Amino acid sequence: GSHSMRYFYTAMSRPGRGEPRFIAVGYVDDTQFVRFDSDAASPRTEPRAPWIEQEGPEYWDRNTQIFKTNTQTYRESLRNLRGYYNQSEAGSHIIQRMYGCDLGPDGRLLRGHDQSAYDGKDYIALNEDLSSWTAADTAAQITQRKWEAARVAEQLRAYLEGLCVEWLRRYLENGKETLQRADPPKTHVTHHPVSDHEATLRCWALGFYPAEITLTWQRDGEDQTQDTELVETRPAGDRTFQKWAAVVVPSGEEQRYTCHVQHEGLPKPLTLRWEP
């Protein structure tokens, strides 16, 4: 129902090893559709999803111009932040930026995003009002004054409320057979004895899209959050995702445990038990 578009920029300095690398990737929901890498033999925006290929040469040339410009801009920004923090020219540092729009299940703009980080720490973020900034420290405050002076917020707001939503809806239509298709998880429970009086119940969810999913174990109807081992949702490599949740239970008490699965693709939440 709900959909989002997001661009992720990573700019990485590397003194003694050339100018900072700039990488940009674009996603609709959990589907990447473009990439750009300033380190590539011949740097250009490239397609990473079938439905984007139909876009014309104007589209690709415009994207590449933007990312090439960004490559240079982010190199200057890296120099700037090094200075803001009085850091050595010997160190490697990273600026990250993520921005994009969220749509509701009806297609309307839910909210916009634009956040930056430096060395993995929040640095500056456009507020939900799309009009004001939140700066993490006195360094980010300098960036803030700069951006206020250039009326950056006003331009992001125009983008996020306009072009971002328009293009997202276009992509959603062009890729509707996949982007607007929720694949439910294939689920089962496996049993792995660990000792004479304990065994592991592992609840599996496989082949689902999008990545958002809830896997929980209950014992006698009570959530076992603190005793459940929950691995991070991982990509299968075919656009689908995998996840499992495990609990160590007393042997013979297996039937007191139930696994519960919530996923957008499910006509109704699932309850599973180990089936000997």
């Binding site: 410009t69 700037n80 250039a150």
Partner: peptide
């Protein structure tokens, strides 16, 4: 489609 930097806006 990505956002164009305004003219051309460093941190």
């Amino acid at each position: 489609r990505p956002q164009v930097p305004l003219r051309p806006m460093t941190y």
